[PDB]
Design a protein around this ligand. Structure first.
Ligand code: HEM
Ligand SMILES: CC(=O)[C@@](C)(O)c1ccc(C(=O)O)cc1
Ligand SMILES: [Cl-]
Length: 393
């Protein structure tokens, strides 16, 4: 009943160009079986959305990587929010949404925007830059660690740790196992900064620790919640902003529209998240035999969702393969959906918005002027290097 496919969605060939294999996965059926890793797969919008919005049947407390925490020891203590189910998930989730709240954005927006404008001015002085290292990486590095309240020393561990975490959701391929080796220094840095004395006052970190008073989290839970933000708060935003710049470089008509109305900046970023979906995939585990679409999945089975595929499903999107900064993106799953929906989405959107606004107002053209280097990661899609010529407006 369920088609079996030999596609390895964690192979370098797949990462290099996933779109054809994603149409094959969508068109094979609403539920496929991936013989390479003995997991179920869902690549259409409808089933991806369904799985994300049934956390009782498709749980996260058995890990959202390939590994089943019921069967193997997690490579690090489980995240209290990503790798938890309701009700244990609920109060830690509420703390993080209050920490990363609409009201919190008001306190950081002006500083994030001035830093975005200053970076674009700096890049315009150099002209030929790497839109990854000099922009997509540099800008979030210039605002997020400080907003966390992190000290200056050791920030070089942050991006390596984030890439490890994302690779670790993957199967035990050499990307993952090489990341887990080589990981000890990054883990020790990150874990130490999660301790209250190391988090500057007013920052996101100290704000998490300040919620240990309410009955929502206990003091021994606060370091792991800080770890969550240091795990998830940087690399995807870098690659989301990298995606947007890449899109504007490949679709000059869209840059011209953005320049003509910079208030499109926020939706231009949202569309880049749909179009390139920095978080490509992750898993749920069935707590129960379930009929998904029209297929039966046993208990205790890993289910791989293809978020980027669902965001390009022609069953849900008109011209899914076009970057359209005026598209109604509402409903894309680039930030997930349901109870785990990205709790840091307001920070990502703010960072992406103020950067695209700075470019919208200051840049006339973005031309690729060197070899584009892709990043290969078991769950992240993004760029290693994106040489561009920025022409000032
Ligand atoms: C473009 C940038 C980002 C993308 C594409 C993204 C993507 C996602 C996705 C798809 C999920 C759902 C995971 C699941 O359902 O299992 C998620 C959850 C999460 N994200 Fe984001 N994220 C981004 C930025 C951020 C930022 C800036 C932060 C923190 C400042 C953050 C922190 C988190 C956390 C803690 C979770 C777990 C939420 C939960 O389990 O309730 N992310 N992210
Ligand atoms: C899988 C995902 O969506 C991502 C990358 O944003 C994420 C990574 C780690 C955590 C955590 O709690 O440590 C939360 C989210
Ligand atoms: Cl860790």
């Amino acid at each position: 009943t369920i088609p079996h496919l030999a596609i390895d969605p964690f192979s370098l060939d797949f990462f290099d160009d996933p779109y054809p294999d994603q149409q094959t996965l969508r068109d094979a059926g609403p539920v496929v079986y991936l013989d390479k890793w003995n997991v179920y797969g869902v690549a259409r919008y409808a089933e991806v959305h369904a799985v994300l919005n049934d956390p009782t049947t498709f749980c996260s407390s058995r890990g959202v990587g390939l590994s089943d925490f019921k069967k193997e020891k997690p490579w690090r203590p489980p995240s209290l929010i990503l790798e938890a189910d309701p009700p244990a998930h609920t109060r830690p989730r509420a703390v993080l949404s209050k920490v990363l709240s609409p009201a919190t954005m008001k306190t950081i927006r002006d500083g994030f925007a001035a830093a975005a404008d200053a970076k674009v001015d700096e890049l315009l002085q150099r002209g030929c830059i790497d839109a990854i290292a000099d922009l997509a990486e540099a800008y979030p590095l210039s605002v997020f660690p400080d907003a966390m309240g992190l000290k200056q020393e050791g920030r070089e561990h942050l991006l390596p740790y984030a890439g490890l975490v994302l690779n670790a959701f993957g199967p035990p391929n050499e990307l993952r196992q090489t990341a887990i080796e080589r990981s000890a220094p990054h883990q020790a840095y990150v874990n130490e900064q999660c301790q209250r004395p190391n988090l500057a006052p007013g920052g996101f970190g100290a704000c998490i620790h300040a919620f240990t008073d309410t009955g929502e989290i206990t003091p021994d839970e606060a370091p792991l919640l800080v770890r969550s933000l240091l795990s998830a708060g940087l690399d995807t935003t870098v690659n989301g902003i990298g995606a947007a710049v890449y899109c504007l470089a490949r679709f000059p008509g869209e840059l011209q529209r953005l320049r003509s109305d910079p208030t499109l900046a926020r939706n231009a970023f949202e569309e880049a998240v749909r179009f390139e979906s920095p978080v490509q995939t992750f898993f749920r585990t069935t707590t129960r035999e379930v009929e998904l679409g029209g297929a039966v999945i046993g208990e205790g089975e890993k289910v791989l969702m293809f978020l980027g595929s669902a965001n390009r499903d022609p069953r849900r999107w008109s011209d899914p393969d076009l970057y359209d900064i005026t598209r109604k993106t509402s409903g894309h799953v680039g930030f997930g959906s349901g109870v785990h929906m990205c709790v840091g989405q307001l920070v990502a959107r703010l960072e992406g918005e103020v950067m695209l606004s700075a470019l919208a107002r200051k840049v006339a053209a973005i031309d690729i002027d060197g070899p584009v280097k892709r990043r290969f990661n078991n769950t992240l899609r993004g760029l290693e290097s994106l040489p561009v010529k920025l022409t000032p407006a």
